[PDB]
Design a protein around this ligand. Sequence first.
Ligand code: HEM
Ligand SMILES: [Cu+2]
Ligand SMILES: [Cu+2]
Ligand SMILES: [Zn+2]
Ligand SMILES: [Zn+2]
Lengths: 155, 155
Amino acid sequence: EKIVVPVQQLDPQNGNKDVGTVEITESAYGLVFTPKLHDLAHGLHGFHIHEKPSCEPKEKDGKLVAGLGAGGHWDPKQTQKHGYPWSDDAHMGDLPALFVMHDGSATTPVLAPRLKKLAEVKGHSLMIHAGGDNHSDHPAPLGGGGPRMACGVIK
Amino acid sequence: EKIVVPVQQLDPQNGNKDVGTVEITESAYGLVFTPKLHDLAHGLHGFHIHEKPSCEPKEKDGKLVAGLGAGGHWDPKQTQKHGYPWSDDAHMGDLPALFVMHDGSATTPVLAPRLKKLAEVKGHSLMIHAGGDNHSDHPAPLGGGGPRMACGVIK
Ligand code: HEM
Ligand SMILES: [Cu+2]
Ligand SMILES: [Cu+2]
Ligand SMILES: [Zn+2]
Ligand SMILES: [Zn+2]
């Protein structure tokens, strides 16, 4: 089995852009997230599963915020702490960061060892942030991901 | 409890340079390699455990080849195939790639889900290549890592 997650670059004002897919598969050691993305900003990006199966924007402080409809990091165990993908004190949605090369493409797979079966992740959203991920809530909350750059619904 | 691996940039002609350490720790999901490196060439770099506890150069067909004293990828199960860290068909030494930022720093930890205890990696070497790693032997052997850029002995 695999899940093919369609991913859009988010722009609530001018309209989202299709940027490819991320394929989720089961390895013998956890779920593998294999990007097949194009036309994204180069850099190493925070990459997390968020709670709600939505990539819609939401209003906050008289501004429409991209991706905010996805809610927070997926946290079924209620750690209320952002962390490493191999830490049991981290949100279940915390994945290794996603690398976009200088040409805007992302093709480097990453493992989430705590996630074992595809059924676990259905009904949630897959988010790529503008910033990175130091896998801590310090010095910036949620790894320093910041704005939500691209998103797809996992189902 | 950790192994602190001292790492040098390899240059047989001009002399090696000290570039920091990589710390190895146990997690509940395998060994974690946490780099604390500086002044390396930027890029996504192949990162593997090699067979021999040496970072010395070795002459091959009349050329002194940096790091060749380390031997090949550590392959105790004899897969004879370079692959993903989460595949049982891959060399045991196959790690996720090492990110070196433009400022020369490497600080992004990676997981080896098939390695469980610190003792298993002692007596080997930790290699960082000039090239990348597509975790295949095609289109280039050994993921396209090419030359050996930096190394430390795991003790
Ligand atoms: C770990 C994170 C990063 C890695 C591994 C990385 C690596 C690279 C590599 C390998 C290249 C192409 C080789 C070269 O021409 O030098 C490159 C190009 C470049 N990178 Fe990065 N980079 C990272 C993050 C960033 C960030 C955050 C920025 C700035 C937003 C940036 C800006 C650039 C620019 C301007 C180029 C030149 C490509 C061009 O001429 O259009 N990089 N980077
Ligand atoms: Cu996120
Ligand atoms: Cu190697
Ligand atoms: Zn998180
Ligand atoms: Zn290998």
